[PDB]
From a paper:
Soaking and cocrystallization experiments provided structures of the ArSqgA·NAD+·SQ and FlSqgA·NAD+·SQ complexes, which diffracted to 2.4 and 2.3 Å, respectively. Both ternary complexes were essentially identical, with respect to the active site interactions. In the ArSqgA·NAD+·SQ complex, SQ is situated above the nicotinamide ring, with C3 of SQ 3.4 Å away from C4 of the nicotinamide ring, at an appropriate distance for hydride transfer and oxidation of C3 of an SQ glycoside. A range of specific interactions occur with the hydroxyl groups of SQ: C1–OH at 2.5 Å from His321 and a water molecule; C2-OH with Tyr136 (2.6 Å); C3–OH with His193 (2.7 Å) and Lys107 (2.6 Å); and C4–OH with Glu189 (2.6 Å). The characteristic 6-sulfonate group of SQ engages in a triad of interactions in the ArSqgA·NAD+·SQ: one oxygen H-bonds to Arg166 (2.6 Å), a second to Lys172 (2.9 Å), and a third to the backbone amide of Leu170 (2.8 Å). Superposition of ArSqgA·NAD+ binary and ArSqgA·NAD+·SQ ternary complexes (backbone RMSD of 0.5 Å over 364 residues) revealed no major structural changes upon binding SQ. The active site was also largely unchanged with the notable exception of the Tyr136 residue in some of the individual protomer chains, which rotated 72° about the Cα–Cβ bond to engage with C2–OH of SQ in the ArSqgA·NAD+·SQ complex. All of these residues are conserved across the studied SqgA homologues. Superposition of the ArSqgA·NAD+·SQ and AmGH109A·NAD+·GalNAc complexes shows that His259 (His193 in ArSqgA) and His404 (His321 in ArSqgA) are structurally conserved.
These new SQases operate through an oxidoreductive mechanism that results in net hydrolysis and involves a catalytic NAD+ cofactor.
Author numbering:
A (entry chain A): 7 to 372
B (entry chain B): 8 to 372
Amino acid sequence: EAVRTIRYGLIGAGHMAREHVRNLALIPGSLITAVSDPQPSSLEETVAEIGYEVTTFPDHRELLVSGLVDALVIASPNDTHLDILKDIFSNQMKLPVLVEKPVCTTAAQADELESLAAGYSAPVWVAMEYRYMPPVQELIQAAHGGKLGNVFMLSIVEHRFPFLHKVDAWNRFNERTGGTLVEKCCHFFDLMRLILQDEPTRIYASGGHDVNHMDELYEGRVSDMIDNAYVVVDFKSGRRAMLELSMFAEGSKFQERISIVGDAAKIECLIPVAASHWIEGDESEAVVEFSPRSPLGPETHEVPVDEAVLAAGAHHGSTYYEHLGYRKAILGEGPVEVTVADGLQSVRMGLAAERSIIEGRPVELL
Amino acid sequence: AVRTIRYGLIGAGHMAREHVRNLALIPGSLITAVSDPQPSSLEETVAEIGYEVTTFPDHRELLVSGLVDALVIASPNDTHLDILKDIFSNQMKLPVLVEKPVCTTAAQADELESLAAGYSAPVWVAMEYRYMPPVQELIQAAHGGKLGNVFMLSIVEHRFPFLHKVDAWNRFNERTGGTLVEKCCHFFDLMRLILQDEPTRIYASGGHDVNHMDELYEGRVSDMIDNAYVVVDFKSGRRAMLELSMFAEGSKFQERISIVGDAAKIECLIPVAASHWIEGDESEAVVEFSPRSPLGPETHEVPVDEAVLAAGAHHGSTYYEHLGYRKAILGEGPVEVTVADGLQSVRMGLAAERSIIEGRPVELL
Ligand SMILES: NC(=O)c1ccc[n+]([C@@H]2O[C@H](COP(=O)([O-])OP(=O)(O)OC[C@H]3O[C@@H](n4cnc5c(N)ncnc54)[C@H](O)[C@@H]3O)[C@@H](O)[C@H]2O)c1
Ligand SMILES: NC(=O)c1ccc[n+]([C@@H]2O[C@H](COP(=O)([O-])OP(=O)(O)OC[C@H]3O[C@@H](n4cnc5c(N)ncnc54)[C@H](O)[C@@H]3O)[C@@H](O)[C@H]2O)c1
Ligand SMILES: O=S(=O)(O)C[C@H]1O[C@H](O)[C@H](O)[C@@H](O)[C@@H]1O
Ligand SMILES: O=S(=O)(O)C[C@H]1O[C@H](O)[C@H](O)[C@@H](O)[C@@H]1O
């Protein structure tokens, strides 16, 4: 068939950018030619990870007119996404974008992004990749395919470690992250829309900042972000979903549990902690359990992931399959599967959840 | 000399027969009197007791029979308060183990609260789940500090549709108090027990989505909820979530309870009762303790005595409930589940039903 070279530019050269790098290295015809980051420590580490020569820029505006790129990846702090997108949108080269979640951090940003994105002709993909985890993909196919009968309930449990230290401590305050239920939980709101094939009408949440980062001072201020919550989401069709989050439950062997209940069957998956975050040599595999109602007899199977695909990132192989899809979108050989529209809904959902917590009331979604 | 107790059973149906089988495992337990307005129920229950007793159609004659030291009530939910009132005004004041829910409406609860404070003899509300051996390990771990400061409690119940009962009593909200009372009082009460706190706010989303759509009473179908998510806030800032599906009987584990603190997480999985699962494929209950700091979860099976497990469908819990009630009858020990505990569980469930209906959280005092 012949591998077609795509020249990628990376705007933001931090932790997640380096994961993008390792996933692009598994995909023939993936050439990184330009990297931007205002911090040279980040560029040194990232160039080293790429392991071949590239052109670096401290500002993305020069990368955009460098003439070196066919497609962009944005992995900068959450509150910078809209501003970089605006510069891409007004650039005269119409370049495809894979923009990291959350696509934006406030309601004002979302209102503005919505108008600007509809006027842009090139593909814009929001990098919420969890659907591409092989076990999650099995649950989606089962739900969409009717293997559960009519679907009514969706539970998502994420039990994990506290937010990691980042460059300039950008992820410690709501003002830069959009809040925990945007930063961390947009993934889950979007899976709810995808799995249930419906739109949310009402969100209620209870949560707090109970445990984490109490001993970290940023100009004498303590982090204001949530570290645990319960969220209950209603949908137009009458389906209902629940998210449980703890950022202080890293002892849990399985970091994610997703369960779906229909009137014919239940299905569930358990996703292990990424090797880099768990005990060496105590690796569990992801499992899927299908539990029909009628002839009682559950079935459990492991869902293997290619060794190299799994080791290239910390999201159970998902970033690789995200890149296969984005590549196809760049070539015009496939559609954008996670759109700006999907991004905006996930953000508004998370924003509504944060407001619900703070004001002790459910929030309607329009 | 053990100390014999003569038990009277008011209500002689399915749960009464479980009470019977558990009492048969406890020396000094003699059933002498059974009451039930339906003779089919009495026949089946007498057969289960397997020795002669005196039967009555009405509990009022049982109460003055002279045959009893203590009572067990296992009648339909909406009859509890009326039987308790007759017990409360009886000349011989007898201890009562009254089945959940202790009552079905807010009017009943207001009335029960005043009447029960004026009654001198023990009244135990028979919410037994705390005595399931795996749940008891979770309670001790939470109370004992093994999790550090406790913040989160999740309870997931995935089970079969409500069973067919005598006179189809459990199909409408007006007789049951609604699903979040009938079925979920157990869970509201465990929340109060495990978190050692009082609720301030409750929110729920639920519907009647799947079950009993083909069972008709003059063209009317059951109006009861068959699935729900409930989120409960507590005075201290602790938070709990209950998930319920009455159409998820395919699940090998019927109950999942998890508790998260700032030092550790603990979780149990409770198997489906043998009588409701495939023969020969019974699973053991597991408890998993998951510390944060030295990564390294620990998993163990929690055995239950074979006869204790086979005597009931609540994983041995009814046995340990009866050990406690026995002590209360003898003046050897306190009532561990009081009427006050019953009322809180009911008002929690009633608030949850109102939350669903009004689309808003309901404040609790
Ligand atoms: N999809 C996922 O699974 C996933 C996982 C982690 C992070 N992310 C997202 O990736 C983004 C980056 O997070 P991270 O973990 O890489 O953090 P990081 O702190 O390791 O990297 C951020 C980098 O951006 C640079 N930067 C700061 N301001 C910039 C600007 N204006 N323009 C360009 N670069 C700028 C910083 O110098 C740093 O190198 C965020 O949106 C985060 O939410 C996504
Ligand atoms: N604690 C538990 O785990 C558990 C389990 C099952 C049932 N229960 C409770 O037990 C009670 C009975 O439920 P069940 O499953 O045994 O139902 P069932 O229908 O099997 O038995 C109920 C019995 O009560 C009798 N009855 C009806 N009206 C009566 C009255 N006025 N006085 C006396 N008896 C009367 C009926 O004739 C019938 O035999 C309910 O409160 C139910 O919620 C508790
Ligand atoms: O653990 S941190 O790196 O602090 C935070 C990150 O955690 C996961 O990777 C999520 O996918 C991601 O959305 C989030 O940005
Ligand atoms: O399955 S049914 O017998 O219809 C329903 C009953 O059964 C369960 O065991 C619960 O413990 C009990 O509280 C509830 O009333």
